[PDB]
C-alpha cells in the first residue's frame, strides 16, 4: 500500500509529513488548471474531512486564495489530525473562510467542488450528513475534483461504501489505487491523474500490482528478425468447436494469426472444420471424425499426435459441455506436454487436480461465470476478486486471466490490471479471439504471463480503434483491427 | 524586499521555512521541464552554496533523482544553514551523490548546470574557487539555469560582483528582483520565470517598485467615447527647435498625434517651422520670429499666449543651449500654469529652483547624460540609480523618467521599470518621439505618472514591432508603428 510508502518516506527517509501534504495539495491545483484552463474565473467549494485527505484539501483551498473568484471550505469533520489542523490554521491565517454547516443551496454559488472528505482512510459505510452532502454534490451538475480517491470508494477494492462521489477528475498521489482501477470505482474516478509528491522512486517502483501500460506492452512485443520464416514465429493447435458451435474455432485461429503467429492448425469436428477455411483459407482446419458432433475419448490419440508438432495448444471454445467432452479434455490435458491455453467449455469441465499434476504450463481464461463455477462460488464473490485469483494461480501453478471490463492477469506473484477495451467486446466471440491471441504470443516465445499481458491490452485497444459506434463492433471486425493496434503500439 | 516577505510568511503566517524551500525547488524543476521538454534524457550538474540558495538547489537535485539520466551535486560551501542542511540530508538519504571538489573537466559529462551557489545572500565580490567555477560554467556552452538570481548579480542593483553566471533561464520566487530588471543583471538572467511558492498574495502585492506590464498599460489607456471631438482628446503645445535642430519639433508633434491627442501646435523659429507641415500637414507649426534662430526672452510673451489655450506644454527638443535659451526656458516655466513635459535642452538649462516653485506639475525626461549634468554627478553615479531618481522626484515635486534600456519612471513614492524596446531606439530622434507621447497622454487626461508609464511601454513596444533588423529602425518608422502597438495592447 501507499500507507507503507508514506510511512517509510516520513520515518526512514525523513521527509516532513507537512511537505508531502503541501506537494499533494499543489498537485491538485496544477491538475485542475490543466483540465479547466485558467482558474481565476471559477468559484471553488472545498469539502474537507478531519483526516489527512481533508488536510490535503486545506492546502488546495489555501493555494486558491487571492487567485480565483471565490473559495469556501466546508469542514465536515469533528477532530483534525495534526497535519489537517496545521493546514486549517494556515488557510485561516491566509484569510480563508470556513463553515461547518452545509446548506443544500450552497452548491448554487460555486462552479467547482473539491472533494477532500475521505481518501484511503474511509472505514465502513458513509451515512448521515456525509452521505447527504455527497448526494447533493452528485445531483449538482458542478465540476467535481476528488482528492486522492472519490469519497466513498474503498481504495483497495473499488467498491462503493453505501454512497460515493462521482468525480470528473481525481488526482491521486504516487501510484493509482486498486479502487481507481476496479469498477464501480473506476467509473466514479473520472479522469485520473497520478501526481509525484516526492516519494523515493524506489518505493514507488516496489508495488507488486500494476496497470498494464502501453510502454510495458511495447517492450514485450517480440522481435521480427528479417531472416525468418514461419517456424520462427511458432505453431499453435486449437482444439475447438462442435456441431452446435462452429464459429468459435475460426475466431480463435485468426486471433493467433493476426498477432504474428507462423502456423495455426484447428482440430474441429467434421464437417464444421470446413467453415474455417471457407472464411480464412490461411487456416489449416483438420477434420475430426466424431460419433455425435462432439470431441470424446475416441479423439484423444489423434489430438495428442497433432500436438507433437506444435508449440502451444489452445482448447475449449465451442467444445460443448457433456460427459464425453469432460473425459476427453481432462485426459488430454493430463497427457499433453506442451503449454495449454484453457478456455470456455474446457474450463467448465476441467478437473483442477489435472492442472496441479501437469509439468507443462497453463493459462486459464475464464469470465466470472466460469470462474464462479470453477471454484464453486457465486459470481459476486469472484468478480474483481484479485486476491482469490492470485490464490488460485499460485495453488494450481498457472496464469489466470479473469476477464471483465477490467481484466486481472496473475501468476500468483505478480498481478496486472488491464483497462483498455470498451462495451463493443460485450458480445459473443470476443473471448474466442483473445484465446487465439494468447496462444499465438506463447508460440512466438513469450512467457504465459507475458503473453496474457500483451494480449489483453492489444485486444482491448483494437476494440477502441473501431471507427463506428462501439456497440456495433463484432469479433470479425475486431480481428481486422488487431494489426492496427500493433502498429499504433510502435 | 522579499527578505521581509519570507520572514513574515514564516514567522507571522506560520508557513514552515522547509515548505517554502520545497516549493522553490520544485518550481525550478517545472520551469526547466517547460523550457527543455522532457527532462529524462538530460544529465544535471547542480552547484550548491551553503546558504538557502543552495538549499533550494538540494531540493532540485533530490527531485531529479531517479527521473533523469544523471544528477551530481557539487557542494561549494563550508557551513550549511539549517534548511540547506536538512535538504542535503534528504538528497543523500534519497541516494544522491555529492562531491566537494570541482575539477575543470566535470562540465564535460553534463548537459545542464543548475546554479544554486548564491542568491539574495551574495555579499561582496566573488573570488577564489567560487569565481573559477562560475568562469568555467560561463565557458562551457552548457544550458544554465539559475536559482533565484544568477550567482554574482546583486539582486538590489543589477551589478556584477566581480563575476557572475550567465543563465539561459532564471527562476525567481514571488516577485522579480531589481537585479533581474537593471543591466547588466537583466542580461545575465536570460529568460525569467517568476514562481509562486506560497506567499500570501497580500504581501506579494505590497512591493512598491514594479515592472510595467501589458495589463497595467491596457487598464490605463484612455477611453474613446464615440460622441467625441478633438477637444475631448486635448491640446498640446510643443516649444522646440532652432536653426541648428529643425527635425526635433516634427518628431515630438507626431508623437503626440499618434497616441490619440486631439490638437498639436508647435512653436518653432521661422523658417524651420515650415519643415513640420511639409512632412505632416496635420500639424500646426507656428512661426516664431527670433534674432539668430534660437528662442530668447523676446519670445516669452508669445509663448505664454500660445499656452493659454492648450492643456499641456512640452519644451526642449532641439532648442539649443546658450544663455538666451536658458533665460527664456526658466522664465517661461516659472510663469507657465500648465503641466510641462521638460526634455533635452530645456533640461540642460533648467534651474531646478524653478521646479520647486511651480504650482503646476512637471515631467522630466533626461537620459543619464542629462541627469548627470542636472545633479552635478557622473553618468556612472546616476545610471540605473533608482534611489537617486526617487529622491530627485520627491524633492522637486515632479515625475522623473530616466531613459535607458531599462527606463525608470518615478514620482518619489511609486517607481516603475520599463523593459520593452530594443537597440533600434539607440538612434537620434527616439527621445523626441517619447516627449510628444507623454505630453499627448497628459492632454488626454492621464496623470503625469500614468502618462509616463503608458508612453515608455508603448514607445519600446512599437520599436519591437519593426519588421526588419532593429538597427535600421528610425524615428519616422517608430511613429508609424505606434498605432499598431496600441492595437496589440487591446
Amino acid at each position: 500500500h501507499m500507507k507503507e510508502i508514506d510511512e517509510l518516506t516520513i520515518k526512514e527517509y525523513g521527509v516532513d509529513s507537512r511537505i508531502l501534504m503541501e506537494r499533494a495539495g499543489i498537485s491538485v491545483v496544477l491538475a485542475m488548471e490543466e483540465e479547466l484552463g485558467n482558474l481565476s474565473d471559477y468559484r471553488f467549494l472545498v469539502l474537507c474531512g478531519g483526516g489527512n485527505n481533508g488536510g490535503d484539501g486545506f492546502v488546495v483551498a489555501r493555494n486558491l486564495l487571492g487567485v480565483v473568484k471565490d473559495v469556501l471550505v466546508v469542514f465536515l469533520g469533528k477532530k483534525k489530525t495534526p497535519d489537517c489542523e496545521y493546514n486549517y490554521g494556515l488557510y485561516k491565517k491566509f484569510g480563508g473562510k470556513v463553515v461547518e454547516q452545509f446548506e443544500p443551496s450552497i452548491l448554487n454559488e460555486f462552479d467547482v467542488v473539491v472533494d477532500a472528505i475521505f481518501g484511503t482512510g474511509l472505514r465502513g459505510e458513509i451515512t448521515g450528513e456525509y452521505a447527504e452532502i455527497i448526494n447533493l454534490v452528485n445531483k449538482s451538475g458542478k465540476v467535481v475534483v476528488s482528492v486522492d480517491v472519490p469519497s466513498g470508494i474503498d481504495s483497495n477494492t473499488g467498491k462503493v461504501l453505501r454512497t460515493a462521489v462521482k468525480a470528473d477528475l481525481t488526482v491521486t498521489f504516487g501510484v493509482p489505487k486498486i479502487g481507481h482501477i476496479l469498477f464501480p470505482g473506476r467509473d466514479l474516478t473520472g479522469k485520473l491523474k497520478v501526481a509525484n509528491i516526492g516519494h523515493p522512486v524506489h518505493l514507488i517502483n516496489s508495488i507488486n500490482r500494476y496497470v498494464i501500460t502501453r510502454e510495458m506492452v511495447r517492450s514485450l512485443l517480440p522481435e521480427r528478425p528479417r531472416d525468418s520464416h514461419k517456424g520462427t514465429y511458432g505453431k499453435v493447435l486449437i482444439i475447438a468447436g462442435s456441431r452446435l458451435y462452429s464459429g468459435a474455432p475460426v475466431l480463435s485461429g485468426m486471433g493467433s494469426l493476426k498477432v504474428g503467429t507462423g502456423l495455426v492448425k484447428l482440430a474441429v469436428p467434421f464437417p464444421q472444420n470446413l467453415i474455417a477455411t471457407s472464411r480464412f483459407p490461411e487456416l489449416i482446419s483438420v477434420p475430426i471424425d466424431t460419433e455425435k458432433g462432439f470431441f470424446s475419448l475416441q479423439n484423444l490419440q489423434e489430438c495428442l499426435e497433432l500436438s507433437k508438432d506444435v508449440d502451444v495448444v489452445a482448447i475449449g471454445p465451442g467444445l460443448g459441455n457433456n460427459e464425453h467432452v469432460r473425459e476427453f479434455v481432462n485426459e488430454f490435458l493430463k497427457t499433453l506436454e506442451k503449454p495449454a491455453v484453457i478456455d470456455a467449455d474446457a474450463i467448465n469441465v476441467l478437473d483442477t487436480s489435472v492442472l496441479k499434476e501437469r509439468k507443462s504450463p497453463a493459462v486459464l481464461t475464464p469470465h466470472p461465470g466460469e470462474m464462479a463455477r470453477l471454484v464453486k462460488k457465486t459470481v459476486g464473490d469472484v468478480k474483481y476478486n484479485y486476491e482469490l485469483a492470485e490464490e488460485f494461480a499460485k495453488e494450481n501453478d498457472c496464469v489466470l486471466v479473469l476477464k471483465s471490463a477490467t481484466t486481472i492477469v496473475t501468476d500468483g506473484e505478480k498481478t496486472l490490471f488491464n483497462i483498455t477495451g470498451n462495451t463493443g467486446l460485450s458480445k459473443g466471440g470476443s473471448g474466442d479471439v483473445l484465446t487465439g491471441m494468447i496462444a499465438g504470443f506463447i508460440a512466438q516465445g513469450l512467457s504465459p504471463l507475458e503473453a496474457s499481458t500483451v494480449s489483453v491490452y492489444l485486444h482491448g485497444f483494437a476494440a477502441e480503434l473501431f471507427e463506428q459506434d462501439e456497440r456495433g463492433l463484432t469479433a470479425s471486425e475486431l480481428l481486422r483491427l488487431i494489426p492496427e493496434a500493433i502498429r499504433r503500439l510502435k | 524586499h522579499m527578505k521581509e516577505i519570507d520572514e513574515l510568511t514564516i514567522k507571522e503566517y506560520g508557513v514552515d521555512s522547509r515548505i517554502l524551500m520545497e516549493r522553490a525547488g520544485i518550481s525550478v524543476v517545472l520551469a526547466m521541464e517547460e523550457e527543455l521538454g522532457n527532462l529524462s534524457d538530460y544529465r544535471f550538474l547542480v552547484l550548491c552554496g551553503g546558504g538557502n540558495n543552495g538549499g533550494d538547489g538540494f531540493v532540485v537535485a533530490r527531485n531529479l533523482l531517479g527521473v533523469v539520466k544523471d544528477v551530481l551535486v557539487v557542494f561549494l560551501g563550508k557551513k550549511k544553514t539549517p534548511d540547506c542542511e536538512y535538504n542535503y540530508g534528504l538528497y543523500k538519504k534519497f541516494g544522491g551523490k555529492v562531491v566537494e571538489q570541482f575539477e575543470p573537466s566535470i562540465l564535460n559529462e553534463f548537459d545542464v548546470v543548475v546554479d544554486a551557489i548564491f542568491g539574495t545572500g551574495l555579499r561582496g565580490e566573488i573570488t577564489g574557487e567560487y569565481a573559477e567555477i562560475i568562469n568555467l560554467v560561463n565557458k562551457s556552452g552548457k544550458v544554465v539555469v539559475s536559482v533565484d538570481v544568477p550567482s554574482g548579480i546583486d539582486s538590489n542593483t543589477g551589478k556584477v560582483l566581480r563575476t557572475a553566471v550567465k543563465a539561459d533561464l532564471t527562476v525567481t520566487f514571488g516577485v522579480p528582483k531589481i537585479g533581474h530588471i537593471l543591466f547588466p543583471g537583466r542580461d545575465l538572467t536570460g529568460k525569467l520565470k517568476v514562481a509562486n511558492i506560497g506567499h500570501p498574495v497580500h504581501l506579494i502585492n505590497s512591493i512598491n517598485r514594479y515592472v510595467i506590464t501589458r495589463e497595467m498599460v491596457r487598464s490605463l489607456l484612455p477611453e474613446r467615447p464615440r460622441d467625441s471631438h478633438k477637444g475631448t482628446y486635448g491640446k498640446v503645445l510643443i516649444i522646440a527647435g532652432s536653426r541648428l535642430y529643425s527635425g526635433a519639433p516634427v518628431l515630438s508633434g507626431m508623437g503626440s498625434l499618434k497616441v490619440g491627442t486631439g490638437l498639436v501646435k508647435l512653436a518653432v523659429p521661422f523658417p524651420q517651422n515650415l519643415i513640420a507641415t511639409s512632412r505632416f500637414p496635420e500639424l500646426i507649426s507656428v512661426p516664431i520670429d527670433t534674432e539668430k534662430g534660437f528662442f530668447s526672452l523676446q519670445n516669452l510673451q508669445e509663448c505664454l499666449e500660445l499656452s493659454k489655450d492648450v492643456d499641456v506644454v512640452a519644451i526642449g527638443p532641439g532648442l539649443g543651449n546658450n544663455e538666451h535659451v536658458r533665460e527664456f526656458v526658466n522664465e517661461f516655466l516659472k510663469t507657465l500654469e500648465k503641466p510641462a513635459v521638460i526634455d533635452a535642452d530645456a533640461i540642460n538649462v533648467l534651474d531646478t529652483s524653478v521646479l520647486k516653485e511651480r504650482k503646476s506639475p512637471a515631467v522630466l525626461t533626461p537620459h543619464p547624460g542629462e541627469m548627470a549634468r542636472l545633479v552635478k554627478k557622473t553618468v556612472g553615479d546616476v545610471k540605473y540609480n533608482y534611489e537617486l531618481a526617487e529622491e530627485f522626484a520627491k524633492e522637486n515635486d515632479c515625475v522623473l523618467v530616466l531613459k535607458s534600456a531599462t527606463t525608470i519612471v518615478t514620482d518619489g513614492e511609486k517607481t516603475l521599470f520599463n523593459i520593452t524596446g530594443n537597440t533600434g531606439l539607440s538612434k537620434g530622434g527616439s527621445g523626441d518621439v517619447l516627449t510628444g507621447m507623454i505630453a499627448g497622454f497628459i492632454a488626454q487626461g492621464l496623470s503625469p505618472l500614468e502618462a509616463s508609464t503608458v508612453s515608455v511601454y508603448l514607445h519600446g513596444f512599437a520599436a519591437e514591432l519593426f519588421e526588419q533588423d532593429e538597427r535600421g529602425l528610425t524615428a519616422s518608422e517608430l511613429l508609424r508603428l505606434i498605432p499598431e502597438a496600441i492595437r496589440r495592447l487591446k
Binding site: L30, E33 | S27, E34, N196
Partner: peptide, 6 residues
C-alpha cells in the same frame, strides 16, 4: 498562470 508569471 497559477505557478509562473512570464
Amino acid at each position: 498562470a497559477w505557478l509562473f508569471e512570464a
